Amino acid sequence: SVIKEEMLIDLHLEGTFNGHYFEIKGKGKGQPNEGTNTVTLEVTKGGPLPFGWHILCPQFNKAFVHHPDNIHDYLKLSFPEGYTWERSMHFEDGGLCCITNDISLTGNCFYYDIKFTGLNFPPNGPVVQKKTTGWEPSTERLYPRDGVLIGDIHHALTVEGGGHYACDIKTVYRAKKAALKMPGYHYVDTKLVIWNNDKEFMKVEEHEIAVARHHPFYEP
Amino acid sequence: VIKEEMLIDLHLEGTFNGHYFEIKGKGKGQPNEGTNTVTLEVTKGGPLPFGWHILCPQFNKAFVHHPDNIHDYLKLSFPEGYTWERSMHFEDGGLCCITNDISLTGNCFYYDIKFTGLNFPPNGPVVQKKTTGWEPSTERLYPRDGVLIGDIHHALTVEGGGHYACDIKTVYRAKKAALKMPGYHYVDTKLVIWNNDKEFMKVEEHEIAVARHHPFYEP
Amino acid sequence: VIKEEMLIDLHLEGTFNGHYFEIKGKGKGQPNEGTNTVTLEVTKGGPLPFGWHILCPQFNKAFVHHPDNIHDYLKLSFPEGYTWERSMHFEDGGLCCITNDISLTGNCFYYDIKFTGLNFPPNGPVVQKKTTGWEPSTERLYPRDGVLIGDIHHALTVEGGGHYACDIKTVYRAKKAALKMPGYHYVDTKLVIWNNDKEFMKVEEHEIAVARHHPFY
Amino acid sequence: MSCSKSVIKEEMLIDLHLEGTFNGHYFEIKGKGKGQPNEGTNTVTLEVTKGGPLPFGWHILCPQFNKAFVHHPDNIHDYLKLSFPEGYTWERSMHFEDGGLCCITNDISLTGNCFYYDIKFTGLNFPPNGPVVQKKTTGWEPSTERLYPRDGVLIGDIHHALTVEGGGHYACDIKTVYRAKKAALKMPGYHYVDTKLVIWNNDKEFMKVEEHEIAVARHHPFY
Ligand code: NA
Ligand code: NA
């Protein structure tokens, strides 16, 4: 297909957090069938950010998920046209993020047009206080509805001094052109880590590994 | 810097269930009368693949009549201005996240609005364009951490009669730290569509709003 | 069915973060005046390991003053009675789920209240007993499917000042189908603790409540 | 050697009582069963004793009818097994995609090899044309709960779903907080429990139901 074993990534993010505007540019490269990708980000406006980097990490494309042959790959099949996703993240202390990405492809490069709004984060929370230290690995549960895919994750940031900061993530993925088939109820396991950052997190390199699977007790 | 009649300039950039759209608008208000009227034009992504009315509240509580005994945090944020950030959770799973950065140059307010609407079901009143307007509302407001938090249990009216409920939280942030803060109080709002074209590409709407204490409030 | 002064007999069974408790009380009210007083005694699992105030609203909107132009769904449910079911989502993740089945025998209302309080954090104002009361409230109510839905953006006051916010939804179900429903409207309520002992084992509380349309109706 | 050491046996019995309301409708259910705590399996048979035939689909009740019956590898601390003989309580919310909300608690105690469940159920705000009231639910998908320790208690969250008649799913976000009655000595870390619950038998009107659960604890696959 148009999905190659190695593909490039060009990212743009415009965001507001507790009313503070910022922009981030990035570029990267991934291995869609291997389920891996690495991106490098640079804050281009509104930096250094007045909140912890890590809530941004999942915003910086589940086309980079390894799919076994018996799970239809809705997102890879959305190309060349592409797809959009829309995400809410409700945090245990009332913080809420609402994020969208419009993903396009030109040549062998994905283009991400990301819009981020973070709101109602308390001033003494781990995000504003920059106390988040990364994400645990996660397992997203996905199911088809109305020709789109809905994924929900019970996820958590790790916090300095040990401990977790829990979040409920919902993502809806919409192929720009009608899918001809849909996967069933399934999961994606993901692990995202920061490889590199400057002290101020103005420049960050991060890596994601992701694999789709059925539940271990699944039956067709 | 707040005058008896002021101008409104606005831009909304938005996404609804992945569909990108832009709206611009202009109008005028009477900040102390608690009234304002805006006219909006869809400039990009029209005609909208959803009912108009969810956008109405997005198109400045500086246009609220305040009595002398309720401190006016938002009017008092100017010249510097304020930002607001709002979530709207609808009874059917639909969610909107909206922001506005309000500035003032001359006697004209500028709204830089960003709208995200997500997870709206295809057969709900929004996508099916079955919303017919808003009920009037009552927002409960309280101070916290030098900012203002307001919550509404609102509802849109729907064609065949009946309501489509929503829970709205707005956080209002002055750009310069406030000297004083208001207490626990309420804003009554009534928003109406004065006119629109068939396809809702141009809409005229009017807002009347008044701040008050609870009827059983004791100083 | 409804008289100018009516008695209240109530029982509450509940758990809060796993801790079982029971409360019994009684009182009286003036359904048309929109007032009622109740006196409660913790009969089981006291002193409660959490602040009293989250329970206050659980201890009958038949005691709301309705003007001539707002159909009184809840008074008109009697003699058969009604049930309500309520959720309270607090800003720190605490959640209460409460039901009440209200019946009428003679002059006296009987409340059978079931309370579950879950996920309240240890350092929050409820567990720490830092709640000092409720603000007055405004419930928005609308009819659907022959039942009444009410929502409140409420708040408890907290020691030292400031508030602890809660979102309350109540669904009120008449036991016999209603041949008349009210429209979109509001109830204004004020609830006060009138007296308590040091450990809140015995509490008296008063409630005034009035229904109305929005001011710009 | 002491009595407390062998409180979890290879085979345990279950005796349960559930009292609940659904959209104001009162009902009671009793049940008995047995399980194999170390194998991660149990089976229970329920009978509706009051307020039946229920005016809603059975399946929302299934997870209410004890994660002591979860297979744990040696490297995941078994908080719930170790809460015994004292036992533990759990408290759960289930927020459904159409606004329906269930709040459920269970106080679990143990005598001999029999667990006793005292279950309290509240189901509210379920729409009249939703799949629960319409009895359109047909069972649960298998699930994966994410668990983490907090303040000496265990918190688990599931993004779960009921299957419904036409094909399709009815999604739910489940939170459970598990509280040992006696303060734990050690806590597990961030981990998962995979569960599959199925109906094994039922009568027409679901007045009597046999259901079976298998559950296994594990770390994330990439762990
Ligand atoms: Na809410
Ligand atoms: Na949730």
Query: Would you kindly state where each structural domain of chain D is located, as residue ranges?
Result: 1-223
User: Contacts for C122-129 with beta carbons within 8 Å, 24 or more apart?
Assistant: C122/D151, C124/C90, C124/C92, C124/C94, C124/C164, C125/C51, C125/C156, C125/C158, C125/C159, C125/C164, C126/C50, C126/C51, C126/C54, C126/C90, C126/C94, C126/C164, C127/C17, C127/C49, C127/C50, C127/C51, C128/C51, C129/C50, C129/C51
Give dist(CA D20, CA D154) in Å, integer.
Answer: 25
Q: DSSP class of residue A176?
A: S
User: And the tokens for D194?
Assistant: 């995979």
Distance D96 CA to ligand 2 centre (A): 9
Distance, in Å, from the CA atom of C62 to the CA atom of B114, rounded to the nearest integer, reads: 44
Q: Can you give the three-state secondary structure of chain D, one letter per residue?
A: CCHHHHCCCCCEEEEEEEEEEECCEEEEEEEEEEEECCCCEEEEEEEEEECCCCCCCHHHHHHHCCCCCCECCCCCCCHHHHCCCCCEEEEEEEEECCCCEEEEEEEEEEECCEEEEEEEEEEECCCCCCCCCCCCEEEECCEEEEEEEECCEEEEEEEEEEEECCCCEEEEEEEEEEEECCCCCCCCCCEEEEEEEEEEEECCCCCEEEEEEEEEEECCCCC
Asked if A65 and A37 count as a contact pair (C-beta separation under 8 A), the reply is no
Q: Residue C49 is encoded by which pair of tokens?
A: 């390991």
Distance CA B141, CA B148 (A): 7
CA-CA-CA-CA dihedral for D173, D179, D185, D186, to nearest 10: 0
Tokens found for residue D65: 């009818």
Chains touching D by CB (3 or more pairs below 8 Å): A, B, C
* Fold of the D1-223 domain: Green Fluorescent Protein (2.40.155)
Q: In angstroms, rounded to a whole number, what is the distance separating the alpha carbons of residues A56 and A112?
A: 14
Residues 53-92 of A with CB under 8 A from C: 92
Q: D160 near A176, Cβ under 8 Å?
A: no
Å from CA of A120 to ligand 1 middle: 14
Task: Report which residue type is found at D122.
Answer: T
Is the minimum CB–CB distance between C128 and chain D shorter than 8 Å?
Answer: no
- Choose the CATH number for C1-217 among 2.60.40.10, 2.40.155.10, 2.30.40.10, 2.130.10.10: 2.40.155.10
Return d(Cα A182, Cα A72) in angstroms, integer. 6
**Which of the following CATH numbers is that of domain A1-220: 3.40.50.1820, 2.40.155.10, 2.40.128.110, 3.20.20.70?**
2.40.155.10
Which ranges constitute the DSSP H helices of B90-156?
none
Quick one: how far is CA B191 from the chain centroid? 9
The residues that bridge with C110 in the sheet, in sequence order, are C9, C103
Task: Round to the nearest angstrom and report the end-to-end CA distance of chain A.
Answer: 27
Amino acid sitting at position A2: V
Contacts of A168 in chain B (CB under 8 A): none
CA of A92 relative to ligand 2 center, distance in Å: 10
> Under an 8 A CB cutoff, do C151 and B138 touch?
no
For residue A106, the CA-to-ligand 1 centroid distance in Å is 42
Q: Which two tokens stand for residue D126?
A: 């379920």
From the candidates C97, C123, C175, which should be mutated to test the interface with D, based on the most D CB atoms within 10 A?
C97
Q: Which among B27, B45, B44 has a CA at the least distance from the CA of B36?
A: B27
Kindly give, in sequence order, each residue whose CB lies less than 8 Å from that of residue A166, ignoring residues fewer than 6 positions away: A91, A92, A154, A155, A156, D148, D155, D157
C-beta separation of D177 from D155 below 8 A: yes
Instruction: For residue A45, count CB atoms less than 10 angstroms from its CB and return exposed for 0-12, middle for 13-18, buried for 19 or more.
Output: exposed
Rounded CA separation D109/D117 (Å): 7
- Rounded CA gap, C142 and C211, in Å? 12
Nearest CA in chain C to B137: C214
Best interface-test mutation with C: which of B65, B151, B153 has the largest number of C CBs within 10 A? B153
- Cα–Cα dist B87/A121, whole Å: 13
Resolution in A: 2.1
User: In one letter, which amino acid is D119?
Assistant: I
Give the distance (Å) from ligand 1 centre to CA of residue A166: 18
Output helix, strand, coil percentages for chain B, rounded to the nearest 5.
5, 55, 40
What does the alpha-carbon distance between residue D120 and residue B50 come to, in Å, rounded to a whole number?
A: 42
Report the chain B residue with the minimal C-alpha distance to residue A170: B119
Cβ D160 vs Cβ D174: under 8 Å = yes
Evaluated on CA atoms D22, D145, D166, D65, the torsion sign reads negative
Chain C residues with CB under 8 Å of B135 CB are 184, 214
Cis peptide leading into A48, omega within 30 of 0?
A: yes
Instruction: Tell me if the bond preceding C79 is cis, omega within 30° of 0.
Output: yes
The whole-angstrom distance between D153's CA and the closest CA on chain A is 13
Instruction: Report the C-alpha gap between D100 and D134 in whole angstroms.
Output: 13
What torsion, rounded to 10 degrees, do the Cα atoms A176, A180, A186, A189 define? -50
What CATH number is given for B1-219 in this structure?
Answer: 2.40.155.10
Q: How far is C-alpha D29 from the geometric centre of its chain's CA atoms? A: 15
How many C-alpha atoms does C78 have within 13 Å on its Cβ side?
Answer: 22
- Which experimental approach was used here? X-ray
Cα–Cα nearest to D160, from D176, D177, D173: D173
Q: Quick check: D101 and D1 in contact, CB under 8 A?
A: no
Tokens encoding D136: 């359109």
Based on C-alpha coordinates, what's the Rg of chain D?
A: 17
| Cα–Cα distance, D71 to D39 (Å, whole number) | 5
Minimal CA–CA distance to C84: which of C111, C55, C56? C111
Cα–Cα dist D8/D202, whole Å: 29
CA D43 to CA D213: how far, in whole Å?
Answer: 6
Q: Which ligand is nearest to the CA of B167?
A: 1
Tell me how far apart the alpha carbons of residues D163 and D165 are, in angstroms, rounded to a whole number.
7
How many whole angstroms separate alpha carbon A106 and alpha carbon A84?
15
